[PDB]
Amino acid sequence: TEQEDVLAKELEDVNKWGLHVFRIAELSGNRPLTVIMHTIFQERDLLKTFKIPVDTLITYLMTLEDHYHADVAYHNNIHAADVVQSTHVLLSTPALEAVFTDLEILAAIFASAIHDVDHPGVSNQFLINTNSELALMYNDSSVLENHHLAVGFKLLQEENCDIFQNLTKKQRQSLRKMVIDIVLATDMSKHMNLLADLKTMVETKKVTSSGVLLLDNYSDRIQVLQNMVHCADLSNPTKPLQLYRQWTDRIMEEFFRQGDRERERGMEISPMCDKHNASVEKSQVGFIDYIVHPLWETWADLVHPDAQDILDTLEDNREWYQSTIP
C-alpha cells in the first residue's frame, strides 16, 4: 500500500504548475481526474462549503472519468485532470485573491473537469463534414462543446452522483449558466473574440485597494473565467518540456488518426493531420506564435507579474522547438 503513499506525495504538488500528471495517472490506477478533483475540493474546502457528500463526489468523479475515452491519445481523462489542475493554480494567483465567490470557483473547476467529456478524438469540422449525428443534433454550432456540457450535466442524474444536491435552487441555476458559458468558450472558433475581449480588459484594467482585480459585473467576471479555463486548455506549451513533449506526441497521434480517416473517406486532409506531409516542430512553433503566446502574454498582463514564470517557460519551450528545426 506504499503506492498510495507515493501518489499522496505527488498530490502535494497540486498547487504547483508542472504537476507530474502522467505519473499521478499511473499511481492512481488511471484515475487522475478523480484523485486530482478530490484533492482540489479538499484543498479549497469545497466538500464542506457546499455540503458535498464524499461518497457522492467520488461516485460522480469516477463516472465522469469513465466517460472520457481511454483510447483517444489527447482528449482523455488525463487532459481533463490537467486542465482542472491548471485552472486550480490559475484561480490561486495573487491578483485574483478573494475575487471570485465559492460558487464561481466551483463552476470553473467543474467546467474544467467536464469540458472535453466523451470527446471522440476528431474535430468539430470533421464531425460537420462527415454529417455526424452530433453535428446534426447541434446544427454545426460548437458541436463537441455542447455535447461535453450535456454529458457532464446528465451524469449528475446517475444514482448518488448529484454532487450539487445541497446547493440552493438559485445556486444551481447560477452555476449551470456559468459552466455553460465557460465550456462553450473552449471552442477555438471563439478564440479570436475571446482574446480581443481579454486585451480590452487589460487595456482598461481596474484594481481594488487590496491590489486584486476589480470585476463588478457578470460580463467581466465570466470573461475572466472563460479565458482562465481557455488558458488552462492551451497550457501544454507553458509546462516543463518533458510534459509538453508528451502532450505534443499525443495530439499528433490524434491528428494523424483523423487525417487517416479523412483519407479513407476521400476528404481533404485537415491541416497538420497528414502524417505523410506534416512538420510537428513547425506546427508547435506556429501554434505558440499565433495562438498560445498571444493568449498567455495577454493573461500575464492581466495578472502581472504573477504569471511571469509560466510565460518564461513558454518562451523557453518555443526557443527549444525552434532549435529542433535547423
Residues that bind a second copy (CB under 8 A): 136-141, 146, 149-150, 153-154, 176-177, 180, 184
For 68-87, give one letter per residue: b (16+ CB within 10 A) or e. bbeebbbbbbbbbbbbbbbb
Given a contact cutoff of 8 angstroms between Cβ atoms, the answer to whether 93 and 86 are in contact is: no
278 binds ligand R75 (CB under 6 A): no
Which 158-197 positions form the footprint of Mg ion (CB under 5 A)?
186
Half-sphere exposure of 285 (CA within 13 A, CB side): 12
Instruction: Identify residue 120 by its one-letter amino acid code.
Output: P
Half-sphere exposure of 65 (CA within 13 A, CB side): 23
SS3 (DSSP) at 207: strand
One residue of 116, 118, 145, 262 binding Zn ion per CB under 5 A: 116
CB of 165 to a second copy, least distance (A): 13
Q: Which is nearer to ligand R75, 2 or 71 (CB)?
A: 71
68 binds ligand R75 (CB under 6 A): no
CB of 265 to ligand R75, least distance (A): 19
Which 111-140 positions form the footprint of Mg ion (CB under 5 A)?
116
Q: What are φ and ψ of residue 164, in 5° steps? A: -105, 15
If one counts every other C-beta atom within 10 angstroms of the C-beta of residue 6, the result is 13
Q: Judge whether 69 counts as a catalytic residue.
A: no
82 binds Mg ion (CB under 5 A): no
With CB cut-offs between 5 and 8 Å by kind, which of Zn ion, a second copy, Mg ion, none does residue 177 bind?
A: a second copy
Write the CA distances from 218 to 104, 178, 215, 226, integer angstroms.
11, 9, 8, 12
One residue of 287, 296, 299, 321 binding ligand R75 per CB under 6 A: 287
Contacting positions for ligand R75 (CB under 6 A): 186, 188, 233, 251, 272, 283, 287, 291
Contacting positions for Zn ion (CB under 5 A): 116, 233
